[PDB]
Structure 1
Amino acid sequence: SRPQSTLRRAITAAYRRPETECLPPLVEAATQSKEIRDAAASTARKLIEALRGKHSGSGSMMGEQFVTGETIREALKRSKELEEKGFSYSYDMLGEAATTAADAERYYRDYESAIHAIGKASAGRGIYEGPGISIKLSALHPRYSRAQAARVMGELLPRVKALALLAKNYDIGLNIDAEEADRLELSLDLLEVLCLDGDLSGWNGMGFVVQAYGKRCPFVLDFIIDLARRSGRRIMVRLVKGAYWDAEIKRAQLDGLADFPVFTRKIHTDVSYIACAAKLLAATDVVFPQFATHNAQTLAAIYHMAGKDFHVGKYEFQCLHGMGEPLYEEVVGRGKLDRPCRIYAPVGTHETLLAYLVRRLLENGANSSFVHRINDPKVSIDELIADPVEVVR
């Protein structure tokens, strides 16, 4: 059969599978024992009570708090304080959706210079304890969303390979951010080619994001875990819910779709995230799970799902600069939960901030978001710590 025919066919089959058909296997995989659910509820209650206690009871629209620096040099200087406490960083040179070849070339050079600076700052700390970088493929090919995959692939692959080689040379992480649903397939084919490229051998810093609001998420994870097994690379896998929900809904409506590529009920994304976390936690020999979330209930659920055995390098949590520090200050550190957290740290100016800021406003301003609900007087602590899997079981 075609290489990985079964795994690839499962991804394609899920693309726009009816939401009601996607959920039952996820609900079963996300169901935890009463004993774990009770312990997770107690942990989540503590995290929320601490969140407010140290921040005047609270759980800017201009978003200066979302950018760590205007240049990589400035961002690296401002990272020392939180690294001393046990946080790590992943730097994001802001910029995406290149419209011209010159723009894509400028973004490439920004990433290249950033890797040199981050690699020097890492100073041999390696991919888990030291800083890394995150990149967006849409920054590196003009009209990434429009051109045929063969053209986008043949030009993008040498650029990403060159960046990955530099990250290998400094032994830092290099993560491919996940963007719109229609570019998942291309990005995953690129990940495969890089993981099978012998020039990158011996480096486990290649990382890839999977969005749990997507119907393909568990099948993409199956493909990635199998790719790790056959390539010999321990792939870093950032599990997120997803940043483009409002845009995906609008696009699917304009595409005339009867079934969308993302879930439309928020708790279905929560169930998908927990089910996918269970899959990742059973594969830590071959992937490095990175649980990106600001939701204290999700965090507590995974913390207890992962069990008592932990070492740095097994898995980590992640958060966004300007959103997650108050929560993760109750997580990192021996007297807290003793689990590491990597801060995603945007670097740039107003000329590159708006697209990211809009996604942050849609995240922070939505009534369904944990970060909004924690400040909503109508939402009880009972509701914040409730397991969403029990709502749909």
Structure 2
Amino acid sequence: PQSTLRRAITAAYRRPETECLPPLVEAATQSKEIRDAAASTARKLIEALRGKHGEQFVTGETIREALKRSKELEEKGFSYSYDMLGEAATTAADAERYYRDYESAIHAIGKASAGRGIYEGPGISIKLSALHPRYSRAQAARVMGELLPRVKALALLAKNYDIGLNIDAEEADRLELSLDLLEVLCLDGDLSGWNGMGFVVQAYGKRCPFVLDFIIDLARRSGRRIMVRLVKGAYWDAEIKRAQLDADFPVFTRKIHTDVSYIACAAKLLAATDVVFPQFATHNAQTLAAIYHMAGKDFHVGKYEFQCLHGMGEPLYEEVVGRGKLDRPCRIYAPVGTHETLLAYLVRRLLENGANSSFVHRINDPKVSIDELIADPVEV
């Protein structure tokens, strides 16, 4: 099981950052016309954002509460991806409870979807670390064989309701295990005809483009239109600190390299909308504007969508969704759970929202101009 696509992923794992960049810079360079139009859109979005000035990140405690609070934005053009927030299960009983929480959430979301299907209707997202009691500490062999039956059962339930089921991306050293899991699922005949299988790839990772080449080819040969959520990445501080402890990082160390990687990978995804459903997860108005223009004038629901986190993205995406704005859909990621189960997620939201490098921090920073906010990362 060492195809040329899989070898390319494994070969990029800790490739020197300096060598990772030129392909990304070239794949991320857009025409002057697209850059100019994206700068104009980005400026307009940012001017709207600056115009109108952890509970905010939790949609509700139960899926029933989250579903009721979602109708308002759903009729404005938003969709949802619900996550029964759990992660880093340390016990078998914890992994079982999270599973039964995901299982019952799928039933509630599936019934609420009511045949809207994978693009117009809500979906679910899961973290594999919630479903295996020693996900980060167990060898991939034993982790695959105990986790695959559980994810399959969830994917079959999502298939039964025709909703999306997305596998979230966590630490860099679990990418390979989750990727072999996605391949087995996309080749499993019990899930045939269902295009709701989803997968996150993190653009701060040096493997991201090769992971996308692998997934694009996997979608094309398997006949599954894989939903690929492109995120920049939530675990940067932790990847750096694990790398320094265990000296080539699996992630970029300059934020701008992640930004270039994201755009490069978005171009690759946008060229493959026949076989994958790109889901561009970002709160960065510049990133959004670039993807919006990179995608061209042709759009239909199901071609691609944007995504955001609940409590972070609605002010930006209220300038995007709907016929009076940009008429592009956005799926809101909806964490569901108690405050205790979501602490680790809120920590990551603190790291994301509080970093001087984050768009969402800079947009409130009176030292940061709009010209700086609309800068094209490749140019910089």
Cα distance, 1:230 vs structure 2: 1.1
User: Deviations 1:163-191 (Å, cap 9, x if unpaired)?
Assistant: 00000000000000000000000000000
Separation in 2 of the partners of 1:220 and 1:4? 13
Does the CA-based 8 Å contact 2:226-2:276 persist in structure 1?
yes
User: Deviations 1:318-360 (Å, cap 9, x if unpaired)?
Assistant: 0000000000000001111110000000001122011000000
Which residue of 1 is the match for residue 5 of structure 2?
7
Cα distance, 1:51 vs structure 2: 1.4
Cα distance, 1:196 vs structure 2: 0.2
198, 202, 207: which one aligns with 2:189: 198
Which residue of 2 is the match for residue 175 of structure 1?
166
Separation in 2 of the partners of 1:294 and 1:279? 20
Cα distance, 1:251 vs structure 2: 0.2
- Stretches of structure 2 lacking an aligned partner (at least 5 in a row): none
Separation in 2 of the partners of 1:317 and 1:221? 17
Does the CA-based 8 Å contact 2:229-2:281 persist in structure 1?
yes
Does the CA-based 8 Å contact 2:166-2:197 persist in structure 1?
yes
Does the CA-based 8 Å contact 2:50-2:364 persist in structure 1?
no
Give the TM-score normalised by structure 1: 0.96
110, 113, 124: which one aligns with 1:119: 110
Separation in 2 of the partners of 1:8 and 1:233? 19
Give the TM-score normalised by structure 2: 0.99
The answer to whether 1:353 aligns with 2:342 is yes
Does the CA-based 8 Å contact 2:270-2:278 persist in structure 1?
yes
Q: Give 1:68-87 correspondences, 5 Å limit.
A: 68-87=59-78
Cα distance, 1:205 vs structure 2: 0.1
Cα distance, 1:229 vs structure 2: 1.0
Separation in 1 of the partners of 2:47 and 2:339? 35
Determine helix, strand or coil for the equivalent of 2:378. Answer: helix
Which residue of 1 is the match for residue 58 of structure 2?
67
Separation in 1 of the partners of 2:369 and 2:345? 30
Determine helix, strand or coil for the equivalent of 1:307. Answer: coil
Does the CA-based 8 Å contact 2:107-2:157 persist in structure 1?
yes
Which residue of 1 is the match for residue 240 of structure 2?
249
Determine helix, strand or coil for the equivalent of 1:350. Answer: coil
Q: Spell out structure 1 runs of 4+ moving beyond 3 A.
A: none
Cα distance, 1:12 vs structure 2: 0.7
User: Aligned residues: percent identity?
Assistant: 100
Aligned residues: 379
Separation in 2 of the partners of 1:5 and 1:321? 38
Q: Give 1:276-355 correspondences, 5 Å limit.
A: 276-355=265-344
Cα distance, 1:4 vs structure 2: 5.6
Separation in 2 of the partners of 1:77 and 1:310? 30
Does the CA-based 8 Å contact 2:167-2:198 persist in structure 1?
yes
Separation in 1 of the partners of 2:144 and 2:327? 41
8, 14, 17: which one aligns with 1:16: 14
Which residue of 2 is the match for residue 58 of structure 1?
none
Does the CA-based 8 Å contact 2:266-2:291 persist in structure 1?
yes
Q: What RMSD over aligned residues (CA atoms) do the two structures have, in Å?
A: 0.7
